[PDB]
Design a protein around this nucleic acid. Structure first.
Ligand SMILES: [Mg+2]
Ligand SMILES: [Zn+2]
Ligand SMILES: [Zn+2]
Lengths: 149, 76, 99, 1331, 246
DNA sequence: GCATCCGTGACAAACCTTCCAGCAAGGGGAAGGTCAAGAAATTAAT
DNA sequence: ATTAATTTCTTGACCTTCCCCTTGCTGGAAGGTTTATAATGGGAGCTGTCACGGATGC
């Protein structure tokens, strides 16, 4: 969760499009890891539809910078989600708020010259708790071209 | 001569002829089959040649007469 | 199709959108560059296109711009400034009636 | 081989080069990947595709090495023949070489005296030329149209012979003359007497004598047969995507051979003249687009709508073959990696990843695995590497020790941006860089991609270990101060170590030394701040290296003794007892390198970094909000500033001043408020209420978290703290002005959205400055590195006996730098002495190191004789005892040290960080120069001369204060009077330059007519006026015929003279001469008559020295300088000396401020026009010792004004290389008015005017060329063909036959041999002797 | 978790990261108070007063939200999400002054100075100065070390000038540019420059001989004719200019 | 002897000829690859 | 200082592919030649590239 915010975090996820956006608001009926089925209420119900807006969440696909894109579902089962809200956070969001990174204890002090010219000195818990580990999806197309031989 | 070559450059006089005769001594140490005058203590031939330079045992004319003695021994 | 595929993917305006963050996507979509045909180049520009004007208040943001050679050519759009029917940038304001 | 010889290509030479000729435009087959017979990639012409494998598959596998297969002509050899096989396209018609046609200069018209418009008329098939005619009407080189060709056909018939195009000019160049035209031009050059003709006929005759001397022919200049590039160099290779990878030069060669085949099909088919003339024109355009695509016309496009690369675009700028594939090239064993911090390492030690050292040291790994017996073969060791065996880490640790490696930042800023390192093996995937040398890199840890280069052989390994290791150089090549000084974090830890308190909870305990100091700091019972007495053992080598032992009690702190534990024996405690700022630690490292030498200094720097890291870990230096305190009287300063700008607005509304004076007043009061709030935050920051040992209240140096970064200068000057805690001073408007409303609030209070916009205006302006002008400084480094590409120390000392008189700058204000750091490392020329004429203590040739700079600092020295490189007599470099000291070593400079690229990296170092009431400030005696002074009737001394420079010399005997005084001043003190500081001693109105007369007599208005020359206008200000004159633009031709002049003589009709000279007392009357005195009054000597009124692009313009925006001309010969023709705006200027060049004239464009009048006495080399001076006339009149002194006093002060000190020798040897080509004045040795190099001029003096006979003519005149000009005037051509205009200088090298001896240092970089510099200088000593 | 450099603050004038660090320490103190009152499971109604007290400390907060209109389960989930720090917004130019950040530190059981007297890990002794410690919310970049570490040793050369390539996906080493050549020549290093431009990258018959010499242990400099200087030679010979060696 | 115009630096569609590889359904010549005979070179009786 | 049973050497005597070729087409690839109403001044940047010298025209 982004601790220090700006107020813009509540709209950048909904306006980016990579998250599950609420086109029609209602009550959560069934949430899977790869899809979210929200039951549309009667006020936002159309007679030409089925009253069910299933959001096919995009799984681990490749971006243009060799990193992961995963629309993780963040809402719980059995809770109302109104119009224009979040259902599944994207690759760098958390509950409709922009989760760019992680928050942890930082100390502005020198320690054995390791932070010499604005460098980072990390603890073990950034990888012991797997806080700063990152999925990176690359592409390697083994191409079988046809030569003369 | 691992951390300081200033004693070598003050006993020789300059940098370029020093490193040229040191590289000549190391080339005679690598494939020439010569024995080092400095103990190794798990070191490569370059710092051994530099330690032979800073001990006053290897110079320009000293390496000249050293290769001349080997040439006179081989051509005999 | 050759023209609309040479512009989409091979022009200086078309580039790889970094999809690592939603912030990167919405700052690359709201990115006002000045390269390609019609605009300037990174090597043939001066200090006039890079240094901002007092008319950049709210329309073209002076912050989000790369630190490379074209430091002022690739500008960006602010949050409240939209496009016009003509195409210029407009800033929304609240009207004051004598205080 | 030892030399590179260039000439023009003969068709027989191409026929010998060919070994196969191409006649068909086929490149390869489209189904099979085999070229067929007689093509652009063919096997008969160039060679086979694979190593020992023929075309059809009949002869292969080393069985047929030199036989030729009769089926397709293939010679079965290696692939190496595909990079050396030539062309010989059988051209049906001769064509124009566009390199010798459309260049600047074209070099085909200057051989013929034909303009380029007529060359375009004849080569493009539009106009005819006749080679010879029976009558004098159709002479040689006549330009005839087609109607004139028809008229000559019906008029002459078979008498004339006039073709069109490249064949006509080819026969004209072939059958003009060989040496008779050269002899006729040589006699007609000096037969005629002119200047506009003798600036191009001498270049024509030099071109022709180069043609006759180099054995070249003008037939070989034009192109009759075109050879193609080798096909491996233009490889049509199948890429791994399905399509092919071709070159655009293959497409241009296919188009050229297609137009050649169309011409060959047009010759036998009996074509009409229009189509064959268009075919030859199109072949000319095709070979023009192949050679240089951007000269003859529009750049030829391809399939992707792009200008295709020609043979000139392959060598042009950074994208050419030189700066991308020849000079700056990719290299193996180079690992791109980021920088990390290794603080547990020595100064010569860096980190290395085990994966990157595993893949990077693969031949060393395989050799050490085969020599130890742990691996059988190479691929078994490779499988041991690919599977990551346990023993390969141990063998990598064995091979990585005693094996230095080169760390390299890309791009480097100076010479210390790349140096060697002895790596250790750690985990991770990055390089742990030692923190002390990151300032020498100027590479902060921002993820900088550092390349790591492996020296392979033992020559390069010992060159890495003994010469370019970080333990070999503790100083910078730019200045004597160490740039490998303790940087920001460790200097903050050391400043926290050396700080003192008043409370000081370890009070009263007397410490036994450094041991007890570190003991009671580490035990926690005593703090790091305790003003106690410590018995410290100190040593000083007062004798010849003999240290003496002494121990006493000093008033110090505990942390200074803990630093003294890391300080070695040879340092004194006078450098350890102060506050120890960054400059103080620089002085400490400098004194350590001067006293102890390099042997304890590296270990001292490593221990200092270790102690600074260990006591910055325990420091807790943490910036906060309450640490960055707001001054208590901050809101009242902003309130008083608001009241002041309200008063300024009310004074602007109620009309008293204008808007410009309002802006100046609001800028002045905002600067005053900024200074007030800066002193307020400084008083609130530097003072802190702390308790004493008893109950007291005493202030001291504060323990604030930002005053440690402010006072010590760790990271950030005083302006950053004054803008952080206090308000912002001034910003930058994009038009160049300052915003009239500065930022009232500070950073801790917050900046408004308007105020952040006014801040980001100047911030984005400075960031655009850093984006553009630092790249401009990089190209300036590219410029300056290619004019000093031959300066190697060849000899030790030459007998020149001449140097420079060095003096510091006191220009305008007080002194800026002393003489000790100015002549630091320099070598004296003569036996300099004390200011008194006795006790000569300095020898002839000695350096200025310890026991020499302080020995002059204890004396009152002000100017010494220093030996330079501008007076060194030897060629192709300078001597060791003429330059001085190598700045990064600290001793006598070795033979081989290339000074010019040192100077280029030194001037390129601060390129990333550049972006009247004369009141004396000291006490001394008044001294002048070129004295013309007299006492008037008021008790003062006026000045009636122009070149008076007021200087102040105290009782000691040094020039502490100096000024530059113009003409028409009044001195309040006399010559030789002891004055005090603060008072004004020179009184003159700065808005006007008066016409003060030294003739004490009557006043007589003579040689003036009221109405024609002068007018009658009384001044309505004071009522004191006379017959005055207006400006010269309003007067009629009466002043143009009779010269107006004020002959101040006696009123009884007789004439008087000047006291001292024999000239009659007649002052001249220029414009704006409104006199304020009547006739008949007895004026005294010194009375006033009238009132006459008055940076990195600048660094690049001063280095180029081409011309400023306003050229300041100087007087040539000392004498009477008058006017020639009268002022038609910009008319003339004449100089009439008494024993000099009498009829020589000059030219004045702007008549704004004339220093000397038209008819007064001047000195040779005296200033005439005011403003920026053009150094061409300064070199033309003054010597090199004055121009070099002016440059090292101007551009070094410009670099010092930014806040960085550079040694003056680096801005001296570049200036020495800026006058490398000189202009000879008399014939007899080389030429009459050629531009010849100083080496070719020195080899002519030592051959004729030394031992052979007398003076055959060897005098010359030096010329400061531009940096773009001196790089095209080098005697070597292959280094000149890499900087810029490779087409132009390569054509100048081809038509002259410039055989390169490869004497310069880059000339062996480009050919790929050992350089004649450094360690390769001793190899070149045997190379040039055995040749 | 992170030890950051305080040296880059006064030169780069970024004092707002210190304000962000103090506000993050205050928000983390509120989060530890919520986690201490949550793991005991004492009551819920004290949290509805405490987090409401933590939501109003400025002059005028833009949202006057109340926890009295919420349910027990919603406040319990809000506190469970507030266990992992406290989400706190601050505008870019209407942000909090240091007085409200000091009030946030006072409400989270923290000193008003912002810098907490810290204890060292290596030596255990407490420093003489209090250390500014808190939350910066730093992010992982795209310039990771597995995308930055890239070396090259004799693999996949070119065909035009017989040159090593560039880029990690192309497996080519970093360019030894011309400024590095001038600096290496300013040192006077001749044998390293004769390797870096002739026998390590240029000569195809030279780098193979150098590799065979290093594999068999002979580290002797064997130079020769560069295979890209003759590229320029044949280029200007095909251009129509005669040139040869001595 | 001066103001003024270009290079050049910029971290279609049929028509007709020769030349060469494939599938019948394989045989033969040139050139290079493995099995049973007698000849060199060793040892146990004097 | 000897020679008689083993153990190699040498020599015919056989054993495979490589390549050209067998009559009879069958298809593919490379190169050159007509076709016959009327067809007659074609086409394309890109400058929003700025500041130097070197040669041209008063
Ligand atoms: Mg950087
Ligand atoms: Zn063949
Ligand atoms: Zn000399």
């Amino acid at each position: 969760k982004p601790l220090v915010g700006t107020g813009m975090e509540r709209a950048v996820a909904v306006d980016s499009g990579v998250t599950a956006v609420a086109k029609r608001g209602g009550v959560v009926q069934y949430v899977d890891a790869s899809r979210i089925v929200i039951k549309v209420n009667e006020d936002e119900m159309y007679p030409g539809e089925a009253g069910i807006d299933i959001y096919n969440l995009t799984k681990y696909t490749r971006s243009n910078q060799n990193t992961c894109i995963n629309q993780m579902p963040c809402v719980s089962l059995g809770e109302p989600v109104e119009r224009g809200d979040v259902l599944a956070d994207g690759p760098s969001t958390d509950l409709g708020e922009l989760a760019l990174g992680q928050n942890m204890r930082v100390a502005f002090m020198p320690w054995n010259g390791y932070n010499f010219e604005d460098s980072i000195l990390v603890s073990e818990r950034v990888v012991q708790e797997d806080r700063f580990t990152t999925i990176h999806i690359q592409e390697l197309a083994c191409v079988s071209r046809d030569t003369k031989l | 001569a691992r951390v300081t070559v200033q004693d070598a450059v003050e006993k020789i006089g300059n940098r370029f002829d020093l490193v040229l005769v040191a590289a000549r001594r190391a080339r005679q140490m690598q494939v020439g089959g010569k024995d080092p005058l400095v103990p190794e203590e798990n070191d490569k031939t370059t710092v051994i040649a530099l330690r032979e330079i800073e001990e006053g045992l290897i110079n320009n004319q000293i390496l000249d007469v050293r290769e001349r003695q080997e040439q006179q021994e081989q051509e005999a | 199709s050759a023209a609309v595929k040479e512009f989409f993917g091979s022009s200086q305006l078309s580039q790889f959108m970094d999809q690592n963050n939603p912030l990167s996507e919405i700052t690359h979509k709201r990115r006002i560059s000045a390269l390609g045909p019609g605009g300037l180049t990174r090597e043939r520009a001066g200090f006039e296109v890079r240094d901002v004007h007092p008319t950049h208040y709210g329309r073209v943001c002076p912050i989000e711009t790369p630190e490379g050679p074209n430091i002022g050519l690739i500008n960006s759009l602010s949050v409240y400034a939209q496009t016009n029917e003509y195409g210029f940038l407009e800033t929304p304001y609240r009207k004051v009636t004598d205080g | 081989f030892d030399a590179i010889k260039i000439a023009l290509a003969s068709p027989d030479m191409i026929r010998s080069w060919s070994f196969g000729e191409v006649k068909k435009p086929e490149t390869i087959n489209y189904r099979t990947f085999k070229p067929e017979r007689d093509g652009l990639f063919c096997a008969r012409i160039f060679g086979p595709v694979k190593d020992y494998e023929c075309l059809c598959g009949k002869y292969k596998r080393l069985k047929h090495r030199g036989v030729i297969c009769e089926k397709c002509g293939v010679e079965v050899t290696q692939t190496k023949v595909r990079r050396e096989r030539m062309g010989h396209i059988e051209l049906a018609s001769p064509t124009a070489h566009i390199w010798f046609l459309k260049s600047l200069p074209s070099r085909i018209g200057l051989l013929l005296d034909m303009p380029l418009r007529d060359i375009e008329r004849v080569l493009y098939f539009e106009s005819y030329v006749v080679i010879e005619g029976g009558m004098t009407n159709l002479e040689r080189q006549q330009i005839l149209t087609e109607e004139q060709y028809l008229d000559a056909l019906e008029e002459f018939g078979d008498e004339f012979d006039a073709k069109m195009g490249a064949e006509a000019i080819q026969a004209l160049l072939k059958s003009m003359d060989l040496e008779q035209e050269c002899e006729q031009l040589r006699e007609e050059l000096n037969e005629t007497n002119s200047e506009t003709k003798r600036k191009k006929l001498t270049k024509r005759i030099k071109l022709l004598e180069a043609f006759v001397q180099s054995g070249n022919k003008p037939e070989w200049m034009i192109l009759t047969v075109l050879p193609v590039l080798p096909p491996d160099l233009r490889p049509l290779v199948p890429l791994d995507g399905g399509r092919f990878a071709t070159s655009d030069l293959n497409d241009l060669y296919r188009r050229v051979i297609n137009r050649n085949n169309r011409l060959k099909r047009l010759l036998d088919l009996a074509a009409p003249d229009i189509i064959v003339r268009n075919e030859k024109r199109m072949l000319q355009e095709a070979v023009d687009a192949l050679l240089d695509n951007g000269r003859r016309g529009r750049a030829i496009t391809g399939s992707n709508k792009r200008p295709l690369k020609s043979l000139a675009d392959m060598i042009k700028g950074k994208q050419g073959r030189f700066r991308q594939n020849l000079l700056g090239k990719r290299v193996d064993y180079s690992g791109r990696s980021v920088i990390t911090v290794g603080p547990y390492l020595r100064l010569h030690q860096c980190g290395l990843p085990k994966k990157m050292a595993l893949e990077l040291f693969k031949p060393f790994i395989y050799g050490k695995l085969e020599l130890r017996g742990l691996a059988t073969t190479i691929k078994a060791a490779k499988k041991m590497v690919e599977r990551e065996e346990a023993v390969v880490w141990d063998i990598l640790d064995e091979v990585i020790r005693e094996h230095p490696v080169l760390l390299n930042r890309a791009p480097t800023l100076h010479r210390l941006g790349i140096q060697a390192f002895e790596p250790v093996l750690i985990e991770g995937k990055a390089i742990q860089l030692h923190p002390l040398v990151c300032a020498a890199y100027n590479a902060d840890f921002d993820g900088d991609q550092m390349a790591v280069h492996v020296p392979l052989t033992l020559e390069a390994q010992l060159e890495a270990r003994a010469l370019m290791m970080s333990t070999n150089n503790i100083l910078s090549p730019a200045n004597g101060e160490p740039i490998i000084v303790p940087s920001q974090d460790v200097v903050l830890g050391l400043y926290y170590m050396t700080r003192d308190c008043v409370n000081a909870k370890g009070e009263g305990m007397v410490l036994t030394g450094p041991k007890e100091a570190e003991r009671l700091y580490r035990s926690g019972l005593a703090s790091l701040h305790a003003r106690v007495k410590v018995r410290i053992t100190e040593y000083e080598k007062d004798a010849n290296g003999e240290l003496v032992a002494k121990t006493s009690l000093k008033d110090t702190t505990v942390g200074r003794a803990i630093l003294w534990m890391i300080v070695p024996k040879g340092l004194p405690y006078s450098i350890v007892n102060q506050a120890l700022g960054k400059k103080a630690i620089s002085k400490m490292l400098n004194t350590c390198y001067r006293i102890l030498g390099l042997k304890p200094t590296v270990i001292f720097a490593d221990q200092i970094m270790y102690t600074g890291f260990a006591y910055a870990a325990r420091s807790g230096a943490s910036v906060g909000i309450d640490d960055m305190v707001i001054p208590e009287k901050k809101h009242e300063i902003i309130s008083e500033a608001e009241a002041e700008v309200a008063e300024i607005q009310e004074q602007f509304q109620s009309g008293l001043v204008t808007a410009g004076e309002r802006y100046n007043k609001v800028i002045d009061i905002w600067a005053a408020a900024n200074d007030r709030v800066s002193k307020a935050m400084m008083d609130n920051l530097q003072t802190e209420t702390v308790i004493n040992r008893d109950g007291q209240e005493e202030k001291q140096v504060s323990f604030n978290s930002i005053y440690m970064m402010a006072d010590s200068g760790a990271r950030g000057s005083a302006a950053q703290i004054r803008q952080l805690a206090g308000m912002r001073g001034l910003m930058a408007k994009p038009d160049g002005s300052i915003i009239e409303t500065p930022i009232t609030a500070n950073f801790r209070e917050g900046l408004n959205v308007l105020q952040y916009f006014i801040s980001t205006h100047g911030a984005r302006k400075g960031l655009a400055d850093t984006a553009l002008k630092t790249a401009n400084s990089g190209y300036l480094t590219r410029r300056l590195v290619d004019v000093a590409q031959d300066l190697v120390v060849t000899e030790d000392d030459c007998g020149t006996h001449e140097g420079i008189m060095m003096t510091p700058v006191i220009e305008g204000g007080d002194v800026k730098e002393p003489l000790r750091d100015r002549v630091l490392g320099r070598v004296t020329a003569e036996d300099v002495l004390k200011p008194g004429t006795a006790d000569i203590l300095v020898p002839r040739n000695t350096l200025l190191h310890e026991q020499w700079c302080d020995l002059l600092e204890e004396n009152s020295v002000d100017a010494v004789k220093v030996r330079s490189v501008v007076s060194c007599d030897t060629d192709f470099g300078v001597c060791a005892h003429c330059y001085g000291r190598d700045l990064a070593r600290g001793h006598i400079i070795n033979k081989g040290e290339a000074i010019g690229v040192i100077a280029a990296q030194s001037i390129g170092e601060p390129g990333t960080q550049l972006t009247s009431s004369i009141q004396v400030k000291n006490k001394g005696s008044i001294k002048l120069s070129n004295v013309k002074s007299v006492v008037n009737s008021s008790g003062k001394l006026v000045i009636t001369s122009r070149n008076t420079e007021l200087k102040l010399i105290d009782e000691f005997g040094r020039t502490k204060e100096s000024y530059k005084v113009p003409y028409g001043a009044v001195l309040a003190k006399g010559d030789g009077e002891q004055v005090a500081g603060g008072e004004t001693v020179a009184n003159w109105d700065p808005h006007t330059m008066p016409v003060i007369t030294e003739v004490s007599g009557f006043v007589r208005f003579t040689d003036m007519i009221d109405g024609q020359t002068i007018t009658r206008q009384t001044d309505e200000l004071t009522g004191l006026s006379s017959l005055v004159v207006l400006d010269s633009a309003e007067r009629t031709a009466g002043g143009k015929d009779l010269r107006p002049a004020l002959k101040i003589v006696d009123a009884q009709g007789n004439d008087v003279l000047i006291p001292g000279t024999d000239m009659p007392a007649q002052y001249f009357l220029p414009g704006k001469a409104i006199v304020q005195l009547e006739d008949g009054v007895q004026i005294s000597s010194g009375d006033t008559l009238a009132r006459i009124p008055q940076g990195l692009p600048r660094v690049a313009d001063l280095f180029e020295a081409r011309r400023p925006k306003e050229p300041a001309i100087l007087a040539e010969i000392s004498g009477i300088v008058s006017f020639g023709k009268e002022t038609k705006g910009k008319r003339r200027l004449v100089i009439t000396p008494v024993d000099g060049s009498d009829p020589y004239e000059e030219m004045i464009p702007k008549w704004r401020q004339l220093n000397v009048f038209e008819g007064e006495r001047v000195e040779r080399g005296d200033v005439i026009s005011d403003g920026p001076e053009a150094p061409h006339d300064i070199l033309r009149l003054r010597g090199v010792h004055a121009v070099t002194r002016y440059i090292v006093n101007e551009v070094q002060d410009v670099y010092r004004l930014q806040g960085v000190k550079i040694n003056d020798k680096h801005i001296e040897v570049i200036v020495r290389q800026m006058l490398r080509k000189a202009t000879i004045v008399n014939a007899g040795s080389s030429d009459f008015l050629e531009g010849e190099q100083v080496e070719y001029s020195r080899v002519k003096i030592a051959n004729r005017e030394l031992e052979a006979n007398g003076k055959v003519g060897a005098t010359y005149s030096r010329d400061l060329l531009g940096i773009t000009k001196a790089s095209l005037a080098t005697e070597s051509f292959i280094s000149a063909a890499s900087f810029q205009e490779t087409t132009r200088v390569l054509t100048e090298a081809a038509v002259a036959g410039k055989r390169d001896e490869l004497r310069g240092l880059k000339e062996n970089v480009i050919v790929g041999r050992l350089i004649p510099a450094g360690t390769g200088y001793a190899y070149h000593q045997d190379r040039m002797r055995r040749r | 978790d992170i030890v950051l450099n305080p040296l880059g603050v006064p030169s780069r004038m970024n004092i707002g990261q210190i304000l962000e660090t103090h506000l993050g320490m205050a928000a983390k103190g509120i989060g530890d108070k919520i986690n201490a009152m949550l793991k005991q499971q004492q009551e819920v109604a004290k949290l509805r007063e405490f987090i409401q007290r933590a939501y109003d400390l400025g002059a005028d907060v833009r949202q006057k939200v109340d926890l009295s209109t919420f349910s027990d389960e919603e406040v319990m989930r809000l506190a469970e999400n507030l266990r992992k720090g406290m989400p706190i917004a601050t505008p870019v130019f209407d942000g909090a002054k240091e007085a409200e950040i000091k009030e946030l530190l006072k409400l989270g059981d923290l000193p008003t100075s912002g810098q907490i007297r810290l204890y060292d890990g290596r030596t255990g002794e407490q420093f003489e100065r209090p250390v500014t410690v808190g939350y910066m919310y730093m992010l992982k970049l795209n310039h990771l070390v597995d995308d930055k570490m890239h070396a090259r040793s004799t693999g996949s050369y070119s065909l035009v000038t017989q040159q090593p390539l560039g880029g990690k996906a192309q497996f080519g080493g970093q360019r030894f540019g011309e400024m590095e050549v001038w600096a290496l020549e300013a040192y006077g290093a001749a044998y390293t420059l004769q390797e870096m431009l002739t026998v390590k990258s240029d000569d195809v018959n030279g780098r193979t001989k150098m590799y065979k010499n290093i594999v068999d242990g002979n580290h002797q400099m064997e130079p020769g004719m560069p295979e890209s200087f003759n590229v320029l030679l044949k280029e200007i010979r095909s251009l129509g200019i005669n040139i040869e060696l001595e």
